[PDB]
Every structure is written in C-alpha cells, then in structure tokens.
Design a protein around this ligand. Structure first.
Ligand SMILES: *C(=O)/C=C/c1ccc(O)cc1
Length: 124
C-alpha cells in the first residue's frame, strides 16, 4: 500500500481499510475504540513490537498490552482526544515492557467516521 507515515489525509486513505489492506503499509498501524480496545493491528506493528497481531485484537491497549504507554504523555493525550472528539498528535516514545527499550515515533489521529482512533508507529 502506497501511503506515507504522517500524511495529512491519512485517515481518508486508511478509512474502512480491511485487515489485509492494513498489512500492506510501511509503518505500524493500530485502530482503537474510545476506551483503548484494539480493533485492528497490522503486520508491520507486530514486526516492530513482537506482539502477535491476531492475539491482541480485543485486548485493552493501555491496561493489558502496553502498560508502558499508561502515562500522561501517551494515554493521557489519547483520552483527551477521545473526550474532545478530535485527536492529531505526533511524538516520540520508548517501548520497554516486553523487550529492550525501543524508540519510535507515534502519530495518533482520530479515524474519519464513527468514534475510532488510529495509533501509527515507526522506528526512529
Ligand atoms: C509499553 O508497554 C508499550 C507496549 C506496546 C507498544 C506498541 C504495541 O503495538 C504493543 C505494545
């Protein structure tokens, strides 16, 4: 899939993409509901993080899968955006729960229709 990380229309291009289409992206992509439950999780993310994309669907990202992101700097920004109904933030972060610390760039952006939210990830 020919889509770049951080592109200004990314929510339109990814919108309603099925699981197989998402696996073709060059960067990690997760779709969360407003509570942080995982709706979609692509192959590129599983390769970065080691998690199995099939097993994490339905788990809570902030409680279960990613406690290192349960902080003001990640989860706090997510819940603020869910509450306001808009979200578009990009920052660097370190994942250090199930592996050696790994630095990434994260882009969280509200998905175009409904009340769903994207978390995009690439290595830095
Ligand atoms: C810290 O606990 C981060 C964990 C994590 C980040 C991203 C993922 O896709 C899965 C786990």
């Amino acid at each position: 899939e020919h889509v770049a990380f951080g592109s200004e229309d990314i929510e339109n291009t990814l919108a309603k993409m099925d699981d197989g289409q998402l696996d073709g992206l060059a960067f990690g992509a997760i779709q969360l509901d407003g509570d942080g439950n995982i709706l979609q999780y692509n192959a590129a993310e599983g390769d970065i993080t080691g998690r199995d994309p099939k097993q994490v669907i339905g788990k809570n990202f902030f409680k279960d899968v990613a406690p290192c992101t349960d902080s003001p700097e990640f989860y706090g920004k997510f819940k603020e955006g869910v509450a306001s109904g808009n979200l578009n933030t990009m920052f660097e972060y370190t994942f250090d729960y199930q592996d050696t610390p790994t630095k990434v760039k994260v882009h969280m952006k509200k998905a175009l229709s409904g009340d769903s939210y994207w978390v995009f990830v690439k290595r830095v």
